[PDB]
Ligand binder design. Structure first.
Ligand SMILES: [Cl-]
Ligand SMILES: [Cl-]
Ligand SMILES: [Cl-]
Ligand SMILES: [Cl-]
Lengths: 303, 304
């Protein structure tokens, strides 16, 4: 049903806000990043789009660049500059005292157009030209080659997000919700998993937590909610990343460390009482439906 | 009914908090408040209903504000602050930007000044966390107040540093702004507070009936858009921008960008030009009219 020239799109602002309906007065459901490819499902004045995690939501028409399959594939083939710092800006000139073009957040990706001084020349999906510092970003080839995707590397990135505010449906370094924290940290390591905590709970290996937590490893996810009964199936309401020694990092009010041990000052009584199970998912990236890297994700590739 | 004395007041203790229509995440965001900002606590249901220094009300989760007695609130407000002047940054556990971070910060954040070390200021949060913040992204409140420029040129200079920042409905920080939130974010970096909604900003300051050639509109005036008044219906305000002169204006729509009323300009905005209603001159009337003030003249920041 979508015309051929607008069946695809690329986000062209640092962070766009996908909503339940095509209006600002509807709840935000997730967020997409600068340079991210999307499928365009419908147009009503707003676009209904589908992100590479298969999540759907609505955005204002001015935040995405609609494209033909040919132009979309061309965008995806071009080597990117990947933003690696949480926050920064792009500039009109290779000088950070020059006029800015936009803010950027980690995970943003722009087309690499060249180099001048300490900057990379970049272009936006809409056609804007800018310069970005080599100290906050790096070429996609270089970045992919040095990428670490182990539990220790992912936990190191999670600690750089401590104190960042909680934001319902937040999916960027600007602000995150419980499942959005997991997604933001993983995207900085080129990984995509399902958006909702209820869907993250059923990917990877389910771990039945031992009373002393001896079978839970660093990098496992911990899930919270309503325990299953004979009459009702379990309900997932929250998620965190396990750090070992009965501690976990999560987003609640802000990103912070909590504990299942009442000796710890950061003991979280409410969530300890609602702990259901853990999941081991990092060994199964690109080995199970819904868990992949962007160079294995069909939204980023011709098909 | 008033709150218990120990929770009648509060201070935001995260960089940006998200105030909603109701005490639940599945209600729309209405505005945002910043780290160190004093608030009045109206009720508690598991969430707090709070009132910010622009008299706007909204709901926040209990974990993002520090509730206080009037005595502790006045003590927080009296303490000289470190004012964050850069759009984005972080605080650290040590006076070293390679050390563990405590939180992100945004411009307009204010923390209690606790000393100095190397290139850092020692600071404390309303909840009690201690950190270090670079002198290159922040400054002591006394020095900041003394060097502050609140003229149209200085305010436009700040607005240009926000170009390309995303639009966010109810966005009221450097992270993302709506049309009226852009005006408020830029003004707060100049110590100024005006009403939150575009429909309330439209009726403060002097109303300017725009001349066809825009010869009576000045840089720093606000431009308002919406539905023109008819004999049966009063005007409706739907959008706002900041006038830059030469028939150009800066506004938040999709992102922060410059648009023009002139069809000869590359950035001509046909839709918004057709719905332009009037302008307002408000910068001469700060602290001279209800709803427009500076934080050292705002009663939420002072004992009363
Ligand atoms: Cl929120
Ligand atoms: Cl829970
Ligand atoms: Cl929005
Ligand atoms: Cl309009």
């Amino acid at each position: 049903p979508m015309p051929a020239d607008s069946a695809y799109g690329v986000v062209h602002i640092s962070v766009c806000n996908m909503r339940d309906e095509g209006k600002f007065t509807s709840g935000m459901s997730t967020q997409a990043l600068l340079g991210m490819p999307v499928k365009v499902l419908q147009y009503t004045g707003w676009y209904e789009i589908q992100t590479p995690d298969d999540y759907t939501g609505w955005v204002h028409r001015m935040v995405i660049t609609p494209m033909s399959k040919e132009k979309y594939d061309e965008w995806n083939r071009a080597e990117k500059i990947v933003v690696t710092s949480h926050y920064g800006f792009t500039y009109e000139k290779p000088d950070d005292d020059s006029q800015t073009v936009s803010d950027v957040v980690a995970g943003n990706r722009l087309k690499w157009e060249g180099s001048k001084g300490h900057f990379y020349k970049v272009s936006y999906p809409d056609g804007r030209q800018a310069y970005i510092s080599r100290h906050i970003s790096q070429p996609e080839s270089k970045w992919r080659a040095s990428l670490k995707q182990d539990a220790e590397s992912i936990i190191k990135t999670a600690y750089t997000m401590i104190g960042i505010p909680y934001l319902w449906a937040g999916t960027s370094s600007k602000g995150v919700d419980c499942s959005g924290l997991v997604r933001t940290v993983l995207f900085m390591h080129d990984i995509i998993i399902p958006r909702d905590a209820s869907q993250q709970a059923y990917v990877g290996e389910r771990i039945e937590i031992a009373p002393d937590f001896s079978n839970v490893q660093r990098g496992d996810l911990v899930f919270f909610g309503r325990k299953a009964t004979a009459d009702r199936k379990e309900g997932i309401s929250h998620v965190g990343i396990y750090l070992g020694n009965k501690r976990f990092i999560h987003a609640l009010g802000d990103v912070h460390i909590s504990s299942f041990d009442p000796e710890d000052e950061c003991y979280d009584e409410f969530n300890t009482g609602r702990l259901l199970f853990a999941t081991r998912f990092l060994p199964y990236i690109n080995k199970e439906k819904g868990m992949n890297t962007t160079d294995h994700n069909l939204y980023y590739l011709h098909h």
